[PDB]
Amino acid sequence: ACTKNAIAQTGFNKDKYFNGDVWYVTDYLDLEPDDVPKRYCAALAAGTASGKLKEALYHYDPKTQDTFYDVSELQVESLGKYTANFKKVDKNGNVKVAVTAGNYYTFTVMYADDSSALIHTCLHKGNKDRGDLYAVLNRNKDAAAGDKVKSAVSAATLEFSKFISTKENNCAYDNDSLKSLLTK
Ligand code: HEM
Ligand SMILES: O=N[O-]
């Protein structure tokens, strides 16, 4: 289970974060051992559609080739803290698994600027017992983490050396599909 109440960035700029552009995961930290594969790749687009906060997700397993997309409408708990009911979709937005109660993740933006972010997520999916996941994001694919986000990791009392890099994995990202999904 998840154990952290992540604190959102003071003065979080929602319009800047939810601007329709893509965020690449470059490093991640799962608090529960063996909760995720050690080699993995993910990206998301966050935006607004008709005034609703939306996220489109992309997961790619560089070994198995398992690939999946999701779309969510986000509900606001407080500035920078959201609850998201996801539907699994193909890259075109065609629904493969409908929204269902108990299938949701929380999402907290702990730090963000024009190029980088640190987020916490807690995934709830059916009978899965998942744990806390932190991710360092960048606007640029596979970019090395800058001093601002690394300092934010420290300020959150996390050790960045413990994070697992995704930058060296053979991963491709369909950024065009992610952006287009924001309306799905
Ligand atoms: C490198 C970072 C990440 C890794 C390694 C990772 C890993 C995984 C894995 C292994 C699964 C499949 C679990 C299963 O069904 O057995 C999964 C599903 C999922 N993850 Fe992530 N994830 C990452 C980033 C994220 C982020 C940033 C979010 C939210 C913004 C997210 C949200 C979800 C959701 C909603 C599902 C279920 C999707 C569905 O079943 O339709 N993940 N993730
Ligand atoms: O491990 N996906 O939150």
Instruction: Considering every ligand atom shown, identify the ligand nearest to the alpha carbon of residue 38 and give its number.
Output: 1
Rounded CA-CA distance 142/36 in Å is: 19
Can you tell me the distance from the alpha carbon of 10 to that of 76, in angstroms, rounded to the nearest whole number? 16
CB distance 72 to ligand 2 below 6 Å:
no
Q: Which two tokens stand for residue 152?
A: 């934010």
**Burial profile 113-130: b = 16 or more Cβ within 10 angstroms, e = fewer:** eeebbbbbbbbbeeeeeb
On whether the CB atoms of residues 113 and 105 are closer than 8 A, the answer is no
20 close to 45: Cβ distance less than 8 angstroms = yes
DSSP notation for 62-108: TTT--EEEEEEEEEEEETTEEEEEEEEE-TT--EEE---TT-EEEEE
Q: In the PDB record, what is the listed experimental method?
A: X-ray
| 26 Cβ contact list (under 8 Å, min separation 6) | 136, 137, 138, 142, 143, 144, 145, 165, 166, 167
Distance CA 107, CA 120 (A): 6
CATH of the domain at 182: 2.40.128.20
Q: Say how many Å lie between the CA of residue 66 and the centre of ligand 2.
A: 14
Residue type, 88: K
Query: For residue 106, how many other CB atoms are within 10 A of its CB?
Result: 20
Print the domain residue range for 104. 1-184
The experimental resolution of this structure, in angstroms, equals 1.4
The number of folded domains in the chain is 1
For residue 35, report the distance from its CA to the centre of ligand 2, in Å: 8
Q: How far apart are CA 89 and CA 72, in angstroms?
A: 10
With a 6 Å cutoff on the Cβ, whether 119 touches ligand 2 is no
The radius of gyration of the chain's CA atoms, rounded to the nearest angstrom, is 15
3-state class percentages of the chain: helix first, strand second, coil last, to nearest 5: 10, 40, 45
Q: Which ligand is nearest to the CA of 83?
A: 1
Is residue 59 annotated as involved in ligand binding?
A: yes
Would you say 131 and 30 are in contact if contact means Cβ atoms under 8 Å apart? Answer: yes
Ligand 2 centroid vs 148 CA: distance in angstroms?
24
